[PDB]
Design a protein around this nucleic acid. Sequence first.
RNA 1: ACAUUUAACUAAAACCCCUACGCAUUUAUAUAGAGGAGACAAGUCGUAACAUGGUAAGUGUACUGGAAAGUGCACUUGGACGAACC
RNA 2: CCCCACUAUGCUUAGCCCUAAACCUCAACAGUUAAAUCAACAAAACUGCUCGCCAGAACACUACGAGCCACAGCUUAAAACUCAAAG
RNA 3: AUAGGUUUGGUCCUAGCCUUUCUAUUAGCUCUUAGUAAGAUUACACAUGCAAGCAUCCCCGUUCCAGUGAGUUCACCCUCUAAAUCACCACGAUCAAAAGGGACAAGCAUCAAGCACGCAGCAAUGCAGCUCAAAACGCUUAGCCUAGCCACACCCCCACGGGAAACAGCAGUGAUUAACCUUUAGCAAUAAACGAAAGUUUAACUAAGCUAUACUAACCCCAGGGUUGGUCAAUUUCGUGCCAGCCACCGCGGUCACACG
Lengths: 108, 168, 215, 43, 110, 51
Amino acid sequence: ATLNQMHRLGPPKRPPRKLGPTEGRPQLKGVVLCTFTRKPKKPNSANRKCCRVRLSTGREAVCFIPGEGHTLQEHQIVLVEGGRTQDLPGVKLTVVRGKYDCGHVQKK
Amino acid sequence: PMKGRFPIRRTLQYLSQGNVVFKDSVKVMTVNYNTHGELGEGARKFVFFNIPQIQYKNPWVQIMMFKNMTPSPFLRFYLDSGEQVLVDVETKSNKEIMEHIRKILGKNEETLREEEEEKKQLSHPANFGPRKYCLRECICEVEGQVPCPSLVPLPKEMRGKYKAALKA
Amino acid sequence: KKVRPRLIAELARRVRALREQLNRPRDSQLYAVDYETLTRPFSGRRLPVRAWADVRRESRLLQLLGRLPLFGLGRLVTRKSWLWQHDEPCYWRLTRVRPDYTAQNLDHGKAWGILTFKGKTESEAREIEHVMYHDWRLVPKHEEEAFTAFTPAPEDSLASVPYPPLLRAMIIAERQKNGDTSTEEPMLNVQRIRMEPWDYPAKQEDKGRAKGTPV
Amino acid sequence: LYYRRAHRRFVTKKALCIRVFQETQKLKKRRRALKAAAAAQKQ
Amino acid sequence: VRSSVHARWIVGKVIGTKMQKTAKVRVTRLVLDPYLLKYFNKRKTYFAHDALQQCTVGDIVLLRALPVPRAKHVKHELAEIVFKVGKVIDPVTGKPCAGTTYLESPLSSE
Amino acid sequence: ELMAWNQAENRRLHELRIARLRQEEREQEQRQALEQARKAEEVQAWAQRKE
RNA sequence: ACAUUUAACUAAAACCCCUACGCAUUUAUAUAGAGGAGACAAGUCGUAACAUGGUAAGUGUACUGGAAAGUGCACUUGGACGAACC
RNA sequence: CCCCACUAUGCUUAGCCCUAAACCUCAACAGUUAAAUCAACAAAACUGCUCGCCAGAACACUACGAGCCACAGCUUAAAACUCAAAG
RNA sequence: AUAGGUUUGGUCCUAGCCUUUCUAUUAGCUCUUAGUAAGAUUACACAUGCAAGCAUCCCCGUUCCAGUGAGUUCACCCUCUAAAUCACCACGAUCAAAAGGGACAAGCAUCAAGCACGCAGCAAUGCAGCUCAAAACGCUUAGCCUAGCCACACCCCCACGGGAAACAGCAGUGAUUAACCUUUAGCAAUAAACGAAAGUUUAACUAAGCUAUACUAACCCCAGGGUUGGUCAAUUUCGUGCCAGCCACCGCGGUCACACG
Ligand SMILES: NC(=O)c1ccc[n+]([C@@H]2O[C@H](COP(=O)([O-])OP(=O)(O)OC[C@H]3O[C@@H](n4cnc5c(N)ncnc54)[C@H](O)[C@@H]3O)[C@@H](O)[C@H]2O)c1
Ligand SMILES: [K+]
Ligand SMILES: [K+]
Ligand SMILES: [K+]
Ligand SMILES: [K+]
Ligand SMILES: [K+]
Ligand SMILES: [K+]
Ligand SMILES: [K+]
Ligand SMILES: [K+]
Ligand SMILES: [K+]
Ligand SMILES: [K+]
Ligand SMILES: [Mg+2]
Ligand SMILES: [Mg+2]
Ligand SMILES: [Mg+2]
Ligand SMILES: [Mg+2]
Ligand SMILES: [Mg+2]
Ligand SMILES: [Mg+2]
Ligand SMILES: [Mg+2]
Ligand SMILES: [Mg+2]
Ligand SMILES: [Mg+2]
Ligand SMILES: [Mg+2]
Ligand SMILES: [Mg+2]
Ligand SMILES: [Mg+2]
Ligand SMILES: [Mg+2]
Ligand SMILES: [Mg+2]
Ligand SMILES: [Mg+2]
Ligand SMILES: [Mg+2]
Ligand SMILES: [Mg+2]
Ligand SMILES: [Mg+2]
Ligand SMILES: [Mg+2]
Ligand SMILES: [Mg+2]
Ligand SMILES: [Mg+2]
Ligand SMILES: [Mg+2]
Ligand SMILES: [Mg+2]
Ligand SMILES: [Mg+2]
Ligand SMILES: [Mg+2]
C-alpha cells in the first residue's frame, strides 16, 4: 500500500480473539448427564470414554474422561478443563481427575 | 525498505534536526511555491525537506501551502500582533531560506538554552519517590542508612512484634 | 460533549433552599436547654461538662433584656467569664436588639452592640456573639460609672525579637556574601503583630447556624 | 459535496422530516401569540 | 488581545457563503502520523463573521478570533482576504497575476 | 530591526528581478519577431494557394 | 398553572403548585415446524472429473434429468492438433 | 453422446435485466536496461508516483441486513462448528 | 527471535497451526524456618459489634479519610472568575469550581445518511440553513494517560418526590464462582477533626493474625513434581496386542511398543 493509503486505514485491527469451550476460564464445574464412548477418527481405533455435562454456564458439552477406569455416574459433580482430545473431533473439554466425584485412577 | 523517496525524512532523528524554533509571535506560516521553473527550485526543496522539520519544532504553528498561485515563490508569516512578514524566497536555496527565517523569526540559541535549564530544575536529585519521577524510592537505598526489612531483617529489638512481648 | 441536562438536581436544590428559609429552626428551638439533664433537646446533644455549672447558675443576655423596657437599649452588659478572667472592664454597649417572638419569655434573639474590651472601645457597633450563652450580666445603672472607670496602662512592649538561630545565620551570611558589612543583628519587627486574647469577641456576622433537623 | 444514492426510503423520510419541521414551526408561532395575548390581559 | 477563543489567527479557504454575514471557512493544519512520521493535512471548519458579505467561495481569508463568541459556532471574524478567487495580486511585486503569469508586467511602473 | 533588514532584503531582490525581467523581454521580442516573419510567409504562401 | 404583600419610637414578618409509563417503544434468548454446512476405518446406485478420462475441460446464462450431470448460445486455455516440402 | 422432426431463442421495433475464464488472470501515468538479472513456471528485471485490492483452508458466487423496473434475480457480504493443512 | 517442528513419493515457494522465553490466576500432587510485599469470583443479599466528634453552651467537623469499578471521552491546556488559605479591611500571591474555547478510548460502514441538528437582528422578525465516507448519526466493549486521576455511593443518570429500608467503611456471614485472610490490639508514631490550649477522637493508620501468590535469606535430620519417539535434556525388563490407553504439534498401540500401564 502507499503511504497515503496506509494512513487512511490506520493500524491493523486485531482480529477479535475467540473464546474457547471454557470461555476464557481455566476450569468449569459441571454435572454429569450421560456417559458414552466415541470412536476416534482415522487412523486410530478405540472406544474412548466420555461424558456429557451441563456446565455452570448452562451449556452442555461432551467431555473426555482421561485415565484407565472411571466411576462417574449421572448427577455427579466434575471439574472440567480445556485441552482437546486429538482423537475425538469436537471433544474440547477434559474431566479433571482428583476433584469432586471424579477420583484419581486406581494404581495398576 | 522504507517507502517513498528520501525515506530519511520520516525518522524522528531527522525531524529533530530542525534549527528553526519560531518566537511566540508567529502564528501562521504560508508557503506559496511554484511546482515548475528553475527559479523556484529552492522553495520546492524547502517544502520537500524542511517543512517537516519546522512543523516538528513548532507544533502549534499553522503551516499552509499554496501551489502555483503567483509567478514567484514567497513566504508570509502572520504574527499575533497582526504584523505580516513577507519573505521572498525566489532564487534562494532551501538552506538559505531555512537560515533566513531563523534569523528574523527564530529564537536564538541563548533563549533555547535558558528554557532547557528551567526544565532541569523540575527534577530535584534529593526528592525520593517512584522511579518515573525520582532517582531513589526510599532512604533505605542510601548506604549507611538502616536497610529495607525486605532485604535485611531488622534487629528483633526494632520490630514491634517483640517491643510488646518484652514489655508484656 | 453536550451534557444531558439534569433538571431534578436543580429543582430539589431550590426547594431545599426555600424550606431552609421557611421551616428554619428558631432561636427558641435551637438554643433551648433542659436544665435537669443539661442537654439541648432540639439537637439532643449534651453540653460540655465544664459548662454545666454556669448554665445552671447564669442567665442569657436577652433573659436580662426581657425584663428591661426597651430590651436594655444603651445599657452596658458584661459577662461573668470576662469579670473572672480580665480585671480591665469588658462590656457591650447595646445598640440594636431583635428579640425572638416565638420564645414565651422573649429570652432568645439577636443583639448588636459596641464592644469595649479591657478598657478599649471599638469605633463601630457590630453583632454580639455568644448571645445564647448563660454567661451575661447586667451592669446596674448606679454602678455603671464605677464599673467603666478604668485608667489606661502603659503600652510599652517589646518591638524587636531576635531571628531564630538558623535564620539569623543565613541573613548575616547573605550580607557578607553580597558585600554588606554591618555589626547590627537582624531583628524581626513584632510591633505590627498584635496578639489578642483567645476570649476576644469574634465576628458574629460570619458565624454559621445550626440546621433544621429536629430531634 | 456528497455522492450517495437517494433511494426510496431516504426520499420518503427526507420529505416527511421537512413536513414535520414546517409543522413544528407553525405550532411554535401559535405558541407565541397565545403567550402574548395572556400577557396583554394582565395589564 | 485577551480572548476566550483558542485559535487566535488562522488562514483558511472559504467554502460556503449561504449564511447571512457568516463565511464557512475550511482551515487545514499539518498533523504528524505517529507511525508513518509523515505530515498529513487535517481540516477543520470555522464560521467567520463577514459583516460586509465580501467573501466568495474559493478565496483565501485570514480569520481573527473574536473577543467572545458571538454565536454558537461563530468565534472568528474576517480580518483579511489574502487571495481573492481569480483576482490575486502578487504580494512580491504588487501586480495582478493569473496563476503563474503576470497580467501586468512588473516593469510597467519600473 | 530585523523587520527592517527583511524589507531591505526584499527590495534588493526586487531590483535583481527587474534586471532579469528586462533581459527576458529582449529575448522574447527577438523570438516573437522571427515567429511573426515565419508566420507571415506561411500565411502568404497559403493565401496564394487559395487564390 | 400560578401567586403581589404586611410592617416600620432600632427593624422585621410573610412565601412551600400539577401533569409521565404501558403488553407503547428498542434489542435479544427461547421454538410447533422447516431446512442447510461440516465431521464421521471399511453402506447403496451410477461413473461426472484427473490420460484427447474415452463426447477436451471450464465460465456466464437458460431449460432438463434418480444422482453425479445433459443440451443450446457466446466466451476462455488453466487442452491438443504431431510443428521443412510430402 | 449419434439420426430425424419441431418450439422458445438467435433477427427487427420499444423498454428491461446488468452477469462472464467481461482473462492479454499482468492497473493508470512517467522513465530505465546498469547493478543483485533472476525461488520455479509463464510473457526478462526494475525505479518514481497514485488509486483499487489482498492477509490459512473450508463454511461461502452462502445466511442476515440494505439497494435495485430485478421477485427461482443481481450487488454488497459474515459468523458458529470443523481441520493442520489448503495452495 | 539467532529461531524450531509440521503440507509432498520427493524438491522449492507461499501459508496457517504449534514448540522453545517471561509473567498472572486456578486445579492436581507436594511442603521446613525467618523477614518483607501482596491478597472475595460477583455494583449479588446481609445477623451482630464497631468505624465522628470536639468544645464553657454558639460555631466548626461528620462534604474529609476509607471503599468500589456500575456507568463512562466531566480528568489535560487556555480564558474567565466564585469559595478557600495567608490572624483581619486590604493587598497581591496560593489553590481551585461554574462558565467559554481546544484537545482526548476500542471494535463495527451489514450503523450511510442525521432530522432542526444553523445564521442574522436591540427586538420584531427574516433567511434555510447546520453535521457527514477526512466517518455525521448509531450499536457494542472497557474505569484511565497510575507520585495518581475520573466516576459512583441501594435503585429511578439527578433525588423535590417515588421504589423501598441499603456494610462497593472494618471484621464477619449467606448465596454464587475455577476463584475462599481475623467477627486482633492501640491511639505510642504520622495524617485528619476540634480547642487559646494542656489534651480528646479516629476499624485512617500503626503493630500483629491468616495464606508457597511473590521476593530475600537460611536449613543439623528432613524433596517433591513433571518428563524421558522427534522438535527437546533424559528408559531397563515385563505386561497389553488398533484392545486398554497416550499425545502441545508430528504421531504411538492390530504378537519382539525406547511413545500405552
Ligand atoms: N462518499 C462521499 O460522499 C465522498 C465525499 C467526499 C469525498 N469522497 C472521496 O471518495 C474517496 C473515498 O471514498 P470512500 O472509500 O469513503 O467510499 P466508499 O467506497 O465507502 O463508498 C461509499 C460511498 O462513497 C461514494 N464514493 C466512492 N468512491 C468515491 C469517490 N472517489 N468520490 C466520491 N464519492 C465516492 C460511493 O458512491 C458511495 O456513495 C476519496 O477520493 C474521497 O476524497 C467521497
Ligand atoms: K493408529
Ligand atoms: K463431461
Ligand atoms: K480436459
Ligand atoms: K484469457
Ligand atoms: K512455517
Ligand atoms: K498450586
Ligand atoms: K467546635
Ligand atoms: K468501571
Ligand atoms: K447512580
Ligand atoms: K494519634
Ligand atoms: Mg424444531
Ligand atoms: Mg468419465
Ligand atoms: Mg469428458
Ligand atoms: Mg460446455
Ligand atoms: Mg437433455
Ligand atoms: Mg494442462
Ligand atoms: Mg422461432
Ligand atoms: Mg474478450
Ligand atoms: Mg486506476
Ligand atoms: Mg510505460
Ligand atoms: Mg455469480
Ligand atoms: Mg446471494
Ligand atoms: Mg447482517
Ligand atoms: Mg435477502
Ligand atoms: Mg475570593
Ligand atoms: Mg471546570
Ligand atoms: Mg469505501
Ligand atoms: Mg464496565
Ligand atoms: Mg444516586
Ligand atoms: Mg467487608
Ligand atoms: Mg451493597
Ligand atoms: Mg486467590
Ligand atoms: Mg499486615
Ligand atoms: Mg511387549
Ligand atoms: Mg512408557
